[model samples]
Target: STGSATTTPIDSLDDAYITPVQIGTPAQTLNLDFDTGSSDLWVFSSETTASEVDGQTIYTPSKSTTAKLLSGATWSISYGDGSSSSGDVYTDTVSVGGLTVTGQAVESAKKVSSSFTEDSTIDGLLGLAFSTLNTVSPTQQKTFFDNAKASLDSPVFTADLGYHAPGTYNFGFIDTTAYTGSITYTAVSTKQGFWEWTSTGYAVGSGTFKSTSIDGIADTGTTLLYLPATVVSAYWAQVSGAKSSSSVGGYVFPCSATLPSFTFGVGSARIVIPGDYIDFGPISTGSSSCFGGIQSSAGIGINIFGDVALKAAFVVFNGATTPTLGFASK
Candidate 1:
């Protein structure tokens, strides 16, 4: 069987995508961040402290007859932005669109950072990465995709992220109409439990594609595209009034400045990201200088092809005997 779900951008800046997920017996719907960067399906639940709960929906396992506590199971995850959540575990019926997974680990958050509370739109997170990255201790659990892949027609799922618009996530099969031309396939390394792949090269605007191998992960959870400092500097240099500022902690330029498009290679295919997509809104609400969506990955160690890049292409995360990533321009 196949499953399909629509995801909408959380805020005006397209920070994160939010998708509806149904959990438990009676079916409690929660809007979650479908993060391909992590592997833990955690949720804001009845156990969470009232002070930490904002307007987000919470999962009440007590109300669901199908909910069962996974005795002695606990989980905790921290993000680069210092946001974190820790909770106990429960196995319950979880459904996304038409796809249903029985006995899926539904981690209920007992403690959450202020950042998560401030973002009232997100009830929790649905991890789309490999099950090897799952945070559950004593007994690791499979992700929603992993559990459903065996029953699927094909062991693959695709992400069609959009720029300031609703996107679609399809399981088991790819929608040909979602992309144009043929797909470029590349080997994926599961060394770090991520959908990590190598890009042939990158170009600034209409410049030539450099024959350099760039390793990065395709992360739907991340908002910005992070590349090498050399590449990032080269792209910003072409834009007028652009500079790396310490105050804002990234490369910023005058909002009115003309920006250049960025192109990256996946095998022989090239995907172009428009300049408007790079201008990631004002540093502060109405500020003249805007932050660039493409930033240096020095601090992050490995490069990251986040939503900024993913939005321009259709990506397939193939979970076959030998995993691979397929990219196609839309």
Candidate 2:
């Protein structure tokens, strides 16, 4: 069976956009971040015309031997980050975990920036975040997930980040045996892929947030979980020795020292944010402090559970089966 699949074509909004995907074996691998914000996957190619690529890894199709290219179609994409590259679309036998998808479409960026060219750790990105941000199309686009989903062991795809370890984004099935709790379900909204809701108020520890109910959306596109200033401040206050550090963008405590677990009451369900996620990483301002799980957004008044906290659990965005998201242990 070919399995159930869907494909979406993505275009460049401005410039500097590409989809990311995983390559290599599961034992030794890399996690690449692709932007649904834009469509195009470019790596520092052997034929690259750019002098240098920064903060990105380059892939050589010739080296893989398994990589193949689609004839006659040339692809190029630029990003808002002031970077650009051009290459050809190709179909190759790409492997993710134990699943292998033949004839997968991928892009090779020939012209890259110094930042992207310089980064040695960078690999390719697979854009599977959402359909709205896809780079493939009915004419000449094929996403990695669209193919992998067919042969994958399960019908579900999930992303899990290791504690202090790089996050894992898997296609097909999720191993629920990793988590330690029961699963929770949230009805999906017919709106878009964005998860929106309002908060009642702030809650410290396990207490219910006051009359401060809030409604907004949850986005995996973002790296930080954004919350209202009042709600964030009140949350930090509950932490022992929790103090605001200017070095870390004035969010909350910077260190990962005994942080408390807080929950955001979203309708009838309560979404939890663990303490370890509270402190991001070290700040550039010379302080050993990092950002807490929840940050303070001035104008965005809405609440967002970004990747930081989302990586801890198994999150399912079911656009095909239903218009709801189901969260559980992986």
Candidate 3:
């Protein structure tokens, strides 16, 4: 079935690598973040000084038999999270799992901040969200999708998130083994790059929940799932031995107990939250005992469904034709 475009869940780890499809010949392997909130493809390079590019993983084209640099037309991007990086553009034969896409665009960072340089686990970000936010211009440059969209086996792309065990997040095609039932899809809006909708309400465990269902946006750039206070409280209450504490900002429970299963309803689609996700603890001061995956973002306003929630389902971003988002079983 043809699906809509939506943000897919991606793990924030160094080992979760996507073979980048670059321009020209010679493909390169680079680690990247599958971000849906933004549109851009960037990677760290050897030319970047160690101090300037500390936490990032740099990819060397010379080391890869299929890597090639674009020479001119440099690129830079700064995110709202206060992290920034800049580098030269390059093209390489990119592949992920068993899929291969030739002539992809990639940015090789020449300068980066300490926050990005200090972390060894994350190298760069590969935005699979939308083409509207793409920084590369058609006149001056071509994005990875712009170059290889016609060659894709299926016009659709799927992201299968597996947090329980190290699983694959595939591009180009969809996988149906992970989900137990038929897939449901929501049409996409043509505004910003995000796939957004107004939820009816959320369900805690198997019971009916009547809390206010807010309009939420799905973003792969965000790390945690943010929900309304009432929604969060109701869900946490269902966990086997979970409780709320005044000291913690949100619901907190002992790590020893086996947390109950929670599901958030998106229309008819029910997304499950695992027990391991409830085991969150002392990260800072006065912070309540919070769930590992769900956090209270009262100040942020809009509800954001991040990677934690997307990891449970198969997400497809249908940008091949126009701005439309869809979700379905893998």
Candidate 4:
């Protein structure tokens, strides 16, 4: 049978999707953040500084009889959001659901940034972007999915993230009942080690679709939808109660505001996001002022269609020779 697993997105301060993965001989289970934007399977471990460790579960290689050290190999990664981690490497048996990948390289964290340690829920990251993006110094490591995919029926995985709700991450096969309509796929470029694609156009409110091009990646690690400042501003213009807030660092609106839905074109398919989806959450605890989930992608160097945009549809990430992205309405 092909490997598959259910990833539940936790509604933390930021929506973080987590999956349980077992490693080593005795099966040490760890809840790891599945970050498609990154390509390193770094985990919290005994190697990490004691002071840096929070409530995260650490993977102790010493307890795993099958764990073998990948001598001299090291990895360090810095995310766009300033989160970073550095670690050494080990090879161990990793299993997700019923699928297993033998001798999977796992990075054991030695140092972690505040962005990571502060988030008690995220133990580490499971990179699904591409093996080319692996940060290992001598020999780059491959993701568990990539290493285990040879035994899969299809070299594919589907992400079904819902809006503030539970979702499933299915591998090797697509559950037809999971999505509606035919899955429309578009060519993806992995030159940057991401599931990057271009959207032909987009529209705000009930307006006609405007012709434009949006180059972005499907990033599960991030929570918001990041577009150009111009595009973000245009959407804010439609919301009567919305305004850019410097303190909050994004558009904010009143809780009572009826936000208009935003739509984007993916090839010939259209993804319509509900207005309520944009009203991410309250800016401050117990406050009526809410922050918008769509923000500017100015400093990031690229637009990112994160969980906000992704939760609106069923997405399939094809990892074959010709990598492609398929999207369909849920």
Compute the lDDT for candidate 1: 0.93
lDDT of each: 0.93, 0.53, 0.60, 0.88
Residue range 1-330, candidate 4, lDDT tens digits: 476677777664337788888988899888888888988998999999999998999999999999999999999999988889998999999888788889999999999999788877778888889899999999888987789778889999888887767777778998899999989999899989999999888899899898899999999888889999988988989877889888888789888788888898899889999987787778889989988988999978999999888889999999888999999998
Q: Higher-lDDT candidate among 2 and 3? A: 3
Worst 10 residues of 1 by lDDT: 74-83
- Evaluate model 3: give its lDDT: 0.60
> By TM-score, how accurate is candidate 4?
0.96
Candidate achieving higher TM-score, 3 or 4 = 4
Which regions in candidate 1 have their CA more than 4 angstroms from the true location? none
Question: Could you give candidate 1's per-residue lDDT for residues 117-192 as a string of tens digits?
Answer: 9999999999988999999988998899999999988999999998989999999998999999999999999999
Clashes of 3: 29
TM-score of each: 0.99, 0.68, 0.76, 0.96
Residue 31 lDDT (model 3): 51
lDDT ranking of the models: 1, 4, 3, 2
Tens-place lDDT per residue, model 3, 97-200, is 43555556766777877667765655677776555665653324544444555666666666655554444555456666656677666666647656665555
| Better candidate number, 3 or 4, judged by lDDT | 4
Selected candidate, larger lDDT, 1 vs 4:
1
User: Residue 285 in candidate 4 has what lDDT?
Assistant: 94
Best by lDDT: 1
